[PDB]
Amino acid sequence: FVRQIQLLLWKNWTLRKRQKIRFVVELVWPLSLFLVLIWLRNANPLYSHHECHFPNKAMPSAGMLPWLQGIFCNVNNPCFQSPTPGESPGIVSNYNNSILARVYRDFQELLMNAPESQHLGRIWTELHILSQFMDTLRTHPERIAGRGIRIRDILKDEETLTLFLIKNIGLSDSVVYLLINSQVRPELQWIEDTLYANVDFFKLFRVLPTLLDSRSQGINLRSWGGILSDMSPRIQEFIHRPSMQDLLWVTRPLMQNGGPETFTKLMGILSDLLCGYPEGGGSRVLSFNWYEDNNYKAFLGIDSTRKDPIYSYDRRTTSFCNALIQSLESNPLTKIAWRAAKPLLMGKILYTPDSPAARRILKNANSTFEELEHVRKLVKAWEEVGPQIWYFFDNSTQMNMIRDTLGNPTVKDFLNRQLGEEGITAEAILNFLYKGPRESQADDMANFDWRDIFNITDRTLRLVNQYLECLVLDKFESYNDETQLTQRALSLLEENMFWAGVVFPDMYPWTSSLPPHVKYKIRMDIDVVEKTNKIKDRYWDSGPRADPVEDFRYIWGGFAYLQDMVEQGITRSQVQAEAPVGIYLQQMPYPCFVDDSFMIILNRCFPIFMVLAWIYSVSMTVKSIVLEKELRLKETLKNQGVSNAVIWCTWFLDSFSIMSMSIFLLTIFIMHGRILHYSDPFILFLFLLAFSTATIMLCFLLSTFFSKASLAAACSGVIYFTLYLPHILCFAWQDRMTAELKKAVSLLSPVAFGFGTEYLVRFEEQGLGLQWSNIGNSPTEGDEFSFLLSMQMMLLDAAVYGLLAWYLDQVFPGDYGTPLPWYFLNITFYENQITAFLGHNGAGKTTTLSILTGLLPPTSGTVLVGGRDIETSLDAVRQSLGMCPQHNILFHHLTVAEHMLFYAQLKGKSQEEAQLEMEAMLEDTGLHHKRNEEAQDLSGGMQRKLSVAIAFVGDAKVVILDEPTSGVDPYSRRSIWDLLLKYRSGRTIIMSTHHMDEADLLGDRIAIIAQGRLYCSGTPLFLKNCGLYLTLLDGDVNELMDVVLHHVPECIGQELIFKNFKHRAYASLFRELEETLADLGLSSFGISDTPLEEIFLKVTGPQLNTGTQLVLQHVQALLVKRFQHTIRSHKDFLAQIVLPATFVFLALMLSIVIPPFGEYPALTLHPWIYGQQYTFFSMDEPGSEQFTVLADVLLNKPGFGNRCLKEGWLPEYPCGNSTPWKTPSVSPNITQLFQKQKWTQVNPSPSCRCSTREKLTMLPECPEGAGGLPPPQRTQRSTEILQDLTDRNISDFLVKTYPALIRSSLKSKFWVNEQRYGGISIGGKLPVVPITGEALVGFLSDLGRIMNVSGGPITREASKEIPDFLKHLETEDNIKVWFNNKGWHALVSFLNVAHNAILRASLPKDRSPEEYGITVISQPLNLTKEQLSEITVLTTSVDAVVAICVIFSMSFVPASFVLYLIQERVNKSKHLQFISGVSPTTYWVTNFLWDIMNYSVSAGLVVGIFIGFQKKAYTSPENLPALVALLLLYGWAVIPMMYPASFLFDVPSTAYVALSCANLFIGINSSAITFILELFENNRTLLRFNAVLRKLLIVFPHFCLGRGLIDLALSQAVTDVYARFGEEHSANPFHWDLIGKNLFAMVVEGVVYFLLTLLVQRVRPGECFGLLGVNGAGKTTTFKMLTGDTTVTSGDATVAGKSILTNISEVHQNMGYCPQFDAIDELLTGREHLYLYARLRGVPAEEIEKVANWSIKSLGLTVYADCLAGTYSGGNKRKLSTAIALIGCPPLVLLDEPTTGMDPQARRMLWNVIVSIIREGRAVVLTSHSMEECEALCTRLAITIQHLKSKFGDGYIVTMLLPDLNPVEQFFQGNFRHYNMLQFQVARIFQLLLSHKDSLYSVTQTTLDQVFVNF
């Protein structure tokens, strides 16, 4: 039966290709969402970074110098691709390439390790010291061997020349002594100088300056000269070394009046001066996960900076310090860094107990601050040592002696021993003592001397002293309890002088001795510490989480530093021993990650968008199927011979074709839009095609539930969207499913699509992206769901949906034969001419018809020559065809020629045969001229003509019909008669209807036998004889009637009514009547024969109220009506009482499930806050006993942390058992790889291949090697696995095994256990200076003894504790604490672990380390008002979403009202009420009143729901009336707002969906815009915001309600905030500033919209007039003009009798033309027996409680009177409509189409009621399209029944074996075709022929049917 598929598919394609709006939308709308996705993809570029190795971070326990150097160097936390030096096992110092370190290295290499130069330098040192000692006069304490007491010796004073001299024989004093005395003296004399005795310059003899030291021998030799010129080559090599040259080249801008960049270039110089990091100084990685901190300001671009503090005058600092603070805070450039650094530099630390134990702990922790104070004192000592240096370089006596030695004749070696050694001798005179005391002029000092550098060094020292004085080093303030703290801390945070509060619990103010286990809490500001309510990063981000400022609050906030200080103080308090070990937190290395945030969107937006891509489409598909079912058109196909599965097969082919085109376009769009980079387009195409197939099965399944096309189209999209939501619910609980409950949930197609696209996103994060070889593999490596199973089970869902849809369609059809069980006498009449079976409906005629249809199986009878339809179902289905039912069976959009082709090819035939048949159109249907016209374009007569002609498209021998012309136009009835007669073809045509006139002329070979038992055969000749009436204002015809009655032996007004033919008597009466016609007033004459309808009948105060008594009664009636309509209807109950209730309940669930945003409790800060993890251990320096015992007390005895304390640490964390050491088993080829190949230290293991710029992977693909040879494991007693990373490359192992660890964890990427958060490397020795302090003090004292600089109080105070300063400057023994920053509280917890290990290692022999420990707790202080503002913003955003949901829920009830109103308006029920006498004002007022009542009930229910939650924001006593007012007034204002939607729209379900969408859109926009634009505190949009709030959006009641709820939430939040702070709040609604504005706006807007709605609203007494003068003219327009439906004045002048106006009755408009029953059932279809009550209580007018008395209106039908109006059939419905139309006894009765399809008996009852009414004296005017009903019901008035026939061209019709007909024809021709019946069209000859009947029958005049103005 493939031809059926082909034909139905062609039909479906032809209908689909003509809509031209669904076609384009179904292809464009899905593309728009993915264009949005493309834009999002372009707006979210991926962030890729290389391998990250981070520099070591020192701690205060490691000494001031490493700690500060780390602080300065690692301000950016740089990423180095190569491992840092600190990551090596034995070394910790990354400052190896710094210029200072290299200069120090060269200093040791050349000077310290010189060739025994130390000995020579020392010898020179004691040489100078001995010379200085000899320089001292020491009064007379001299050896007296030589006259050298004092004053440059006294040789002249004491010698042999004293007194008279002459001791040496002939000694003379300046008298040219012949003999010179030399025995008593160590060394031509005359008065004149330069003589023979004065030949020597100074002293020729005794040139040695030693002079045996003048005491105890020890003469100073030339050892100083020997050392001289030996230091010169080494000094030159040191100076010319590249390190020293680099030092000079970088230091030139420094220490000068330069600094071109005040801070940018200074940092650049200081970096390579102190840090010297490789690469370009490293690079920082940026943390983009702003949503993890709830930092909405960062996303929106708001500044998010706290308010600046006040100047606070000067405080206790210096003027320079205050100026610096004010400049730093005021400068916008440097206020952020200064804000971060101020608590550290100048802040206070507060401790609560104030106990002797606490004071001891803090004194021990003070070490860093004593060290800083010592540095400050050392710098301050310059103030009193600098002038001494300057004076020493002034005269003094040492510098003068040096100058004299240089000033000696030739200065011994004038050119120096090291001649030409780049050093001039004048450098000892100038540039060292230039110009003596002072320079002669500016720049005359050779520009470089002692003072030239003295100013620069003095200025630098004084400036650094000034800067250092701006520091607070007495940071510890003692309080009494934690209540006094957090109050001082609040003020300090206000002025930014608070570091932390170190509160010690479990210890009283009098506690002196420390407990073995010490707990303490560090209380920080929440802005400088990680939040304690969250420990992980939620959504796992590919990245190291290593932004220096964004996610290192523990470092730069001072938490880690203070924790280290406090724990070190506790350690020193407990152990009472010197075991100095530092801490070197070192972040774990990270591999080549790729951060693609767009995947998040792709993980959430891709499914929903796809669903939203089909919503409209799915609706249309359903709108097709139900449209084939509601139009009784699927049953037409089933009668035609479809299989009930070929139709759905073709529906699939059509829908699948359109969806396949759409999916092809979407796949091309996605691939070329770079939404998916690394995916094969074919698998994505197949995934989308499987989703499409599941969607089409959803369409088929949903089409069975519904029976109305419009409702199905409106609601199918709603079900389709709703079905996806379970996926959203399951995504939050993704870990809950165990691949079995997930399967159960995924029976829904959207949920399975969501799972599949989740797997797609997971594969797209990698470089694979759903290839053919990985669809069946789950990337999580632990889930059995996979992705291929997703597509397969979506196909399974499609099959299940289709099967269940087929089952339901078979079992629950619309109206047809249904197999409820779970399956999965009689003869033939004449066979020629147009036979007609006439009978009452339901009396067996329909049963005989159905038996003849073939539907009911034939029993003991033959439908045709085939024997039986039961015996031969295939036969008599092609010939016995053309089944024309009462329903018009056509297509909405298909063409007439297309109908002909489709129906000709459906019943056999072929395309050529169908085309040939369509060519023979047999005229009609506009011939071939109207071929291109669509079926809907054709008029009703044309539509029915085509429907009947469709029966003759195929060659059909038997064409049985059912009312071909039941309600067709009279001209159209003639046309259909001509078409049907022209297609007789000798066929057994059978037609059945209640219209006998249709069988009068076109009916031949009549057989009215369907009477239930075939009582009468009813052949036309036989039916004729089962008498004739005579037709002819004078009023005297009563006497004339007797004459005619006597001549030929039912009278009414304006007319005359009165075998065995009696020709002689009849002809005599006819001649007498014709002769007397002139005398009488009759204009014409006629003859009436026996009607065919009668043949079938053979078997069968004032009562009226006036004035104000109306309106009140009016409203009651209307109220009552709607009351009934809201009791019978249950849809109006679910759409008004529960739907808002359920949505509000869901919204409140959402509100209460969200956790509070500002809890921040105390966190115990231990590594086991993360459950299962690997912690690693490295042992370096095994020789040290201290490190061995530290490893012992770290590994097994107490273990890590404090979980094992021998006395119970935490009940929630018990201690288990420790497994023995075990190296994990490894694959054989891994060992082969590691043994066969060569691996060096630089390349110890295979390298992970990360992103290659063309295949970007989230993490590198690590080969089988990775770290390699897994380390031994222990499964520590703390239920955590310890790895032994001893003698192994820790950095390589970590960075290459991290991906393997994290692949297992990231099964969901929502709460990941990285299984590795920290580790300990016990080792790393920092080289220290060998000065040892005391030697330095001795050297400085000796130097100060050489020249009397001495010192003062400051120098002595500085020198008191130099050895302690040197000891605390740096720490030699150290331990590294590796931490993973992706765990937030990781580094602090492992500081705690390391300090516990250090404390346990230092314990004495006794006092077992099991019990000792330290516990750190992070408990942030109470939030400030600025932070509480953000918390309030978050909470009120949740409340705003709740308010939006409340608006959306409450908008349903007014929508239900609008659907009621539109349903009442469309079916003209509202117009009927207006016609009866309901004024528009009264109608709208009572509708508004009832709507307010219903909404009040619904809002009371919603208020009950709210109060059931005890929400303080809304349900508090001061807010409950507010919430009630908001709800009630919102409804009361929004109901009139959408009243006009009744006029705008015409379809109820469409109105519901459109109004719900509009309300949701308006509500979300109104709430969100005002809630978001108010967040921008400092902007120019605020005015814009106000232009949105006060004026723009206040018009919408949605905005009023939403802003009211939001403002209530904000007011309650701020009231709670002030109550927490104790300031209290007014909290008074109805103030016009909080909520009163919205209430007044609602009050005004309700009235305004109600007025807008009211503005939108803007014949003789006894003769029936048949208003059918022109059929083509719009009589419906005339009736509307006579009624209130149309106000067009372009019409004829008419009056209602009582009043005359433009609208006839416009002058009065009261109780005029009361009935207006048109060709429409103006029934509410929900009220029973109340129509006669509603249409009488006051609606026509109040009849004074006479409702029961006026029960006569129930004469037509009393059995169905008490049943629902929609419950019973159309005949009873229209009988009730007519009864309520003429219920008020009006003078004028309007009737349109007086009787539609109804039983002839009921039609007779209606006609007798009408004629009785018109005889009573009530005027009736009637119109009809059948026009057969006008006869015998309407009076002489017509648009004269006999007069019209006579005036128009017409005449009487005369009707009379085979040879016997010849005499009749010959006789008939004498006076003036079919077998046994002659139809001759034709007065004197007629009378004569009647008398001559024997020589040769019934004769009737022209009827109203014949010649109905054909023109």
Ligand SMILES: CCCCCCCC/C=C\CCCCCCCC(=O)O[C@@H](COC(=O)CCCCCCC/C=C/CCCCCCCC)COP(=O)(O)OCC\N=C/C=C(C)\C=C\C=C(C)/C=C\C1=C(C)CCCC1(C)C
């Ligand atoms: C104009 C654009 C130009 C620039 C281009 C950028 C455009 C691209 C758009 C984004 C580029 C980057 C992609 C990041 C977002 C894209 C992800 C997406 O699209 O879907 C999300 C929707 O999730 C939700 O919104 C609530 C569910 C959270 C459940 C947590 C449970 C407990 C927490 C409850 C607190 C909830 C507060 C109440 C929320 C009220 C509703 C807003 C599914 O999150 P996920 O878990 O699947 O992924 C992990 C992400 N982690 C947290 C996600 C968010 C959004 C945190 C927002 C945090 C906030 C404060 C959101 C909104 C804000 C609040 C409420 C008040 C201030 C105003 C503001 C609107 C800014």
Ligand SMILES: *[C@@H]1O[C@H](CO)[C@@H](O)[C@H](O)[C@H]1NC(C)=O
């Ligand atoms: C400083 O030296 C000068 C130079 O001779 C000399 O007057 C004296 O030693 C000092 N000057 C004083 C003390 O004014």
Ligand SMILES: *[C@@H]1O[C@H](CO)[C@@H](O)[C@H](O)[C@H]1NC(C)=O
């Ligand atoms: C090593 O052996 C394992 C399992 O025996 C296998 O999966 C892997 O592919 C092998 N590798 C090589 C290089 O043979």
Ligand SMILES: *[C@@H]1O[C@H](CO)[C@@H](O)[C@H](O)[C@H]1NC(C)=O
């Ligand atoms: C050093 O001693 C000299 C004399 O020997 C004296 O003039 C000078 O003031 C001293 N310097 C001091 C005490 O700083």
Ligand SMILES: *[C@@H]1O[C@H](CO)[C@@H](O)[C@H](O)[C@H]1NC(C)=O
């Ligand atoms: C901090 O908040 C707690 C929470 O209950 C409160 O008890 C305490 O008094 C607050 N301290 C202040 C506001 O100083």
Ligand SMILES: [Mg+2]
């Ligand atoms: Mg972050």
